[PDB]
Structure formats: structure tokens, C-alpha cells
């Protein structure tokens, strides 16, 4: 049985490995999400997962793909630690408290609470990472920061500690939607496969269920994700509120804009989840048997 130290250390490393591997997908998602906000005279247009990544690598280099990565690693550490140390206690309070099974309701509430606390703790990392991923020298917007800690100090000094929590409520709602949609969709798909006997219950079945649920959650959260990215990236004063940003997006680009960066978002969710699962299991097994 993995101890807490090996679980916490394994979760941190698996999350960080998955993040460094799938970070170009996240950067491509952000670039696709902020593309139509401000018109650009440059002929550099982002279209697709590999199209966006290749355009970024050609016009800005490889290190521009991993811009804000230290912020992403900090977020991964805090989120993984909060999962390993808090999702356990709330879940076991809901299950063993009434001696009930981990029903979907208990799972929904546990994920909601853990995700909310994690979003609140890791919001400054999200602000810094999103602004660094979206900043570019080629579209007429002057980059505000040179790196993760430059961004940290500049945001803190010029706009307060509170300004490091900009976009918490969109991120919090997006977390709620991701969690609820993913859990409901996975249950519905797995019950369809197991009752209609469309597929046998082996890990291929759970993989199809999880992939379908991840895509459904990504599609369901895409409007909030686009609005959250644009709001977090915006400098002070551009948007009166988060509904203001959403309404401007709607009236100036339409319902399709709310799904900008949908393919990179879903690919990063799926690849991150599989990489973290594999790395986490292998790492905690080797640390426990070491």
C-alpha cells in the first residue's frame, strides 16, 4: 500500500511529466482561443493543433511553446497535492460516513469541493501561465512579461495580489462543468456499453467511456474556457466583467468562437490523463516496492 509520501510525490511527478509533455497542446489551445480577439496584420493564422504548434515553432521558436511552463508546473504540484490529500478525506467522509458506496452524487460533490479548492489555490499560476502562453511579438500586442516570475512580480506590484486571482469565477464554473459533465457522461456511456453489451467491460471499454466523457466535458466547458482565457488574458479595464467578455465574444464572433481551441483542449485532456495515470501508477508502485 502506497504511503502518503509516495502518493504525494508520485502524483506531483506524474502531473508534472504529463504537463511538460502536453504543454504545447495547451499553448496551442490558448493561441487559438485568443486569436480573433484583436485583429492582426500579420499573415500568421492559427488553424489546427499541429498547424498552430508548427506556426508557433517557426515564427517564435520551440521555447515559445513552453511559455509559462513553470507556472504550469506549480499549478500541477498544488492541484495534485490537493487531490491526493483532500479528495481522499471528503470522499471517505461521504462513503464511510453513512457506510454508503461511492455513488455518483458523492463523487460529484467530492470532485466539486476538491476542484474548487484547487482552482482557488492555483489561480495565480493560471493567470501567469495563460498570459505568458498568449503573449506574442507578432500580433501587435506588446508582451507584458519576460517569464513566470517576472509576470508574478509585475502583476502583484502593478495590480495587487487580488489581480493574481483574476478569472477565478470563470475557472471555478469551468471546473464545475468539467467535473459534472465528465462523471455523468462516463456513467451513461459505461452503462450503455455494459447493458447493451456493445463492448465487453475490459479496459478498452473504460477507455472508450473515458474518451467520450472527456470530449463531452471539453465541449461542454469550451464556452466558459474561451471566455475565461480571454478574460484572464485581458489587461485591466478591457472587460467590465466576465459576462461582458462573453457578450462581446458572442456579438463580434458568434457561437463558433466559444469553441475556439476545442481540439487542442480535448487532446491535452486525454493525453494528460493517460500520461499521468500511467506515470503515477508506475511511479508509486516503484517507490513503494523500493
Amino acid at each position, epitope marked *: 500500500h502506497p504511503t502518503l509520501g509516495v502518493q504525494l510525490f508520485s502524483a506531483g511527478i506524474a502531473a508534472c511529466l504529463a504537463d511538460v509533455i502536453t504543454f504545447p497542446l495547451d499553448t496551442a489551445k490558448v493561441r487559438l482561443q485568443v486569436q480573433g480577439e484583436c*485583429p492582426t*496584420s500579420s499573415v500568421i493564422r492559427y488553424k489546427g493543433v499541429l498547424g498552430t504548434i508548427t506556426a508557433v515553432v517557426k515564427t517564435e521558436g520551440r521555447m515559445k511553446l513552453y511559455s509559462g511552463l513553470p507556472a504550469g508546473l506549480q499549478r500541477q504540484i498544488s492541484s495534485a497535492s490537493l487531490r491526493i490529500g483532500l479528495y481522499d478525506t471528503v470522499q471517505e467522509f461521504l462513503t464511510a460516513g453513512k457506510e454508503t458506496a461511492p455513488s455518483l452524487g458523492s463523487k460529484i460533490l467530492a470532485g466539486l469541493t476538491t476542484g474548487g479548492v484547487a482552482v482557488f489555490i492555483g489561480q495565480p499560476t493560471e493567470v501567469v501561465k495563460v498570459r505568458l502562453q498568449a503573449q506574442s511579438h507578432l500580433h501587435g500586442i506588446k508582451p507584458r512579461y519576460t517569464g513566470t516570475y517576472n509576470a508574478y512580480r509585475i502583476i502583484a506590484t502593478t495590480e495587487g495580489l487580488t489581480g493574481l486571482w483574476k478569472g477565478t469565477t470563470p475557472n471555478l464554473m469551468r471546473s464545475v462543468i468539467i467535473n459534472c459533465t465528465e462523471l455523468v457522461t462516463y456513467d451513461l456511456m459505461k452503462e450503455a456499453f455494459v447493458k447493451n453489451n456493445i463492448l465487453a467491460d475490459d479496459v478498452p471499454c473504460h477507455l472508450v467511456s473515458a474518451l467520450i466523457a472527456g470530449f463531452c466535458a471539453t465541449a461542454m466547458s469550451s464556452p466558459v474556457d474561451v471566455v475565461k482565457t480571454r478574460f484572464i488574458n485581458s489587461p485591466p*479595464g*478591457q472587460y467590465k466583467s466576465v459576462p461582458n467578455c462573453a457578450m462581446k465574444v*458572442f*456579438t*463580434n*464572433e*458568434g457561437p463558433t468562437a466559444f469553441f475556439k481551441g476545442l481540439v487542442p483542449s480535448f487532446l491535452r485532456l486525454g493525453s494528460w490523463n493517460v500520461i499521468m495515470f500511467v506515470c503515477f501508477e508506475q511511479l508509486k508502485r516503484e517507490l513503494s516496492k523500493s
Partner: nanobody
Amino acid sequence: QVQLVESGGGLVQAGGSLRLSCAASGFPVMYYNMHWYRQAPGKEREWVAAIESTGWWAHYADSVKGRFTISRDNAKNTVYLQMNSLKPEDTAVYYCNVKDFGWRWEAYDYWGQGTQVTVSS
């Protein structure tokens, strides 16, 4: 009932200045980017300038950048085009434009009637 009304055009000597105004009506202008186009006869309508919903960014055609400035006031529902060092090739009908995208496949263009700007040489 979208309605854009341009004004302020007229006959000006080359090198002179002119401020075009656009009174917008029938829609919440605080949410829409506003555009200035122009068209001279024998030519196609040329995009001139664009301004963000609250004036956060402004973009110009390369032919007018520096000479033309686009400006906004949402408390008066008005969009402004200041034109300086005017030159005879700027003689055209200038059009206020709203691209209302909304629940649509493509954006829908709402135009004004245009105001005529004639530059004498």
C-alpha cells in the same frame, strides 16, 4: 432597428482635416466593434478603420494609418473618424459599419448611408 447615420463629410482642400461622426442607434453599441469603410466610384468599398467595443484597440488600413484616427464614445452612441493631411485620393463616400455576428453563420453588415468627403487639389 439598427440605424447608422454618418455626418461631418464635406469639401476640403488637400492637406486639410475633417472629423466624421457616426450616430449609431437601435443596438447596444457598447458590445460591437465599429468599422469605417469608404468607396469611391469606379472602385470597391475599402475598409478604412476598426475600433473595439470600448475602444481598447484601433486598427487602420495602411493607406490611412497616421493620417486617420478612429475614436469612440458609447455614452453618445457615436463613432468618430478624424482625418488629417487629406489628399485627393481620399475622396470617397465614407460608411459606418457594424458587423453583427450573433446567432448567425456569418456576420451581417449594417451600413450607414455614407457621408461624402471630397478633397480639392
